[PDB]
């Protein structure tokens, strides 16, 4: 009967044997003010796109996995500038 605890969404969390009373006990609270890079649950939005197939490009390439080089290629954290607090993945349970 824990009607006064941290509801994640619909679930009450448990971290060190006891039910999470408030958000101040969670680890995410230490980085709750930084715009995080990725949020660990990763809910996909609207279905993923299908796998387009063709018999022209696969037959012409004869394998050779021609990879496109004009992509975005999301960079990493430069070794000199520490690791930005944003790089810590938020594990927003609720």
């Amino acid at each position: 009967g824990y009607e006064n605890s941290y509801d994640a969404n619909g679930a009450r969390l448990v971290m060190d044997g006891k039910v999470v009373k408030s958000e101040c006990q969670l680890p995410s609270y230490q980085i709750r003010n930084s715009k995080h890079h990725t949020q660990l649950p990763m809910r996909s939005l609207n279905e993923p796109p299908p796998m387009v197939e063709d018999l022209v490009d696969e037959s012409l390439f004869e394998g050779l996995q021609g990879y496109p080089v004009d992509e975005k290629l999301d960079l990493l954290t430069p070794p000199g500038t520490a690791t930005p607090s944003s790089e810590w993945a938020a594990i927003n349970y609720g």
């Binding site: 971290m15 060190d16 101040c24 006990q25 680890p27 995410s28 609270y29 230490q30 980085i31 954290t77 430069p78 070794p79 000199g80 520490a82 690791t83 607090s85 810590w88 993945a89 938020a90 594990i91």
Partner: protein, 434 residues
């Protein structure tokens, strides 16, 4: 009596006792957070044996961890004098991973180099007692060895690793066991029939915090200024009978470096950093008819006899510029540790500190190689002209020469110990810098 000294008071005492600041006759104490320490065994994943890679994972039984000791049970595959720090040789390396990130890694050779430079006196002897057989044990003898780890949190309470604050990150250790250990399962290149496989166990000393400290660890973000070891192997520009070889080795290091350390060695014989010779302790059977200068007296592999060291001189360059004047190998072997450590370094092992006191935890000057586009270690070797089988040839030689057997020291090991920052937040941890 003592009063006759007290009465001898005047102007020159003012700078020592005028307006006293402290009294030496009264101890002041500090109320420290209550805690307890408990030794808990961790398990090993994988099959323990020579040449196998096994690992552990440190459970969250306590809040913080410090010392870690790996126990091994080994047998002697031969008589006294056939082994040399075999438990150290066996633990080929240990990799420290937090959250999947490689934080650090130690190597058997590093443990040997580290010991050679930083342990001393009875600390060193007691250490040897935990990794070797030092009471003239014979073939078939069996002992438990204790190989302490030397990661940053394994050296001081001050860096106890905050397992408590790592809600989502496990701390793991990967241990590689050497395929061969001298005097245990191999004798030089020969295998020892019937040799037993090691028994292994990893012990972790856990710190239990009180309520208040525990709370702070859970709620506050943390950062630790910690050490890391950088290491690469290189071929030695092997010297010869007619020449002083020289070599420019790129120092592919980064981060604020406390010190560099290096040695030359014979890959066949663990801990051999010097040439072999027919002088007592310098080779198998040295000093007698049976002496050979192709195999060491394993139990006496290490020596303080520089005549058997290979390096003539060295300097460190930063971006092609000399960092300091070229000094002799004996300067790196004897003076550097005199000044910076206060122990005694065996021949073949060299140190160059960028720090006032590299033996301590507190940073005291570093070379940040993250700001040096091209650092180089420049080494000059001695001429390998001395006939190692003739005791006189060795004992009576000159500064610029060494044993013909010094050309067996074909490997160069260069280490750099540096400072990084371990950041902990939101239940996760990892390093600040690549």
């Amino acid at each position: 009596g003592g009063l006759s000294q007290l009465v001898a008071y005047g102007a020159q005492d003012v700078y020592l006792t005028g307006n006293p600041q402290i009294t030496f006759f009264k101890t002041v104490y500090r109320r420290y957070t209550n805690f307890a320490i408990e030794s808990i065994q961790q398990t090993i994943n994988g099959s323990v044996g020579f040449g196998n890679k096994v690992s552990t994972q440190i459970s969250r039984n306590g809040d913080l961890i410090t010392d870690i000791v790996v126990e091994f049970v080994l047998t002697k595959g031969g008589n006294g004098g056939t082994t040399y720090y075999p438990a150290e040789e066996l633990l080929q390396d240990v990799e420290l991973e937090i959250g999947g990130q490689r934080i650090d890694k130690h190597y058997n050779d590093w443990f040997r180099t580290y010991d050679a430079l930083f342990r001393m006196n009875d600390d060193r002897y007691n250490y040897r007692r935990m990794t070797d057989w030092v009471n003239n044990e014979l073939v078939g003898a069996q002992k438990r060895f204790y190989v302490p780890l030397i990661f940053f949190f394994n050296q001081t309470p001050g860096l106890a690793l905050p397992l408590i604050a790592l809600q989502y990150h496990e701390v793991k250790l990967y241990f590689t066991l050497a395929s061969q250990v001298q005097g245990v399962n191999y004798n030089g290149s020969s295998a020892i029939a019937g040799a037993a496989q090691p028994t292994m166990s990893v012990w972790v000393d856990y710190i239990f915090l009180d309520t208040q400290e525990r709370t702070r660890f859970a709620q506050l973000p943390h950062e630790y200024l910690i050490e890391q070891l950088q290491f690469t192997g290189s071929e030695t520009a092997t010297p010869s009978a007619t020449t002083q070889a020289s070599q420019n080795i790129r120092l592919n290091f980064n981060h604020p470096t406390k010190y560099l350390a290096w040695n030359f060695n014979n890959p066949t014989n663990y801990g051999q950093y010097t040439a072999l010779a027919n002088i007592p302790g310098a080779c198998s059977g040295a000093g007698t008819a049976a002496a050979t200068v192709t195999t060491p007296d394993y139990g006496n592999t290490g020596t303080y006899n520089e005549q058997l060291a290979v390096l003539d001189s060295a300097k460190i360059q930063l971006n092609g510029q000399d960092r300091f004047a070229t000094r002799k190998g004996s300067y790196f072997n004897k003076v550097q540790p005199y000044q910076s450590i206060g122990g005694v370094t065996p021949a073949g092992v060299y140190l160059y500190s960028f720090a006032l006191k590299p033996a301590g935890r507190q940073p005291s000057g570093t070379c940040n190689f993250s700001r040096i586009d091209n650092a180089t270690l420049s080494l000059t070797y001695k001429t390998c002209s001395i006939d190692a089988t003739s005791p006189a040839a060795v004992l009576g030689n000159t500064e610029t020469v060494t044993a013909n057997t010094a050309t067996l020291l074909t490997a160069l090991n260069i280490y750099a110990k540096n400072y990084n920052v371990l950041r902990i937040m939101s239940g996760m941890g990892g390093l600040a810098y690549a």
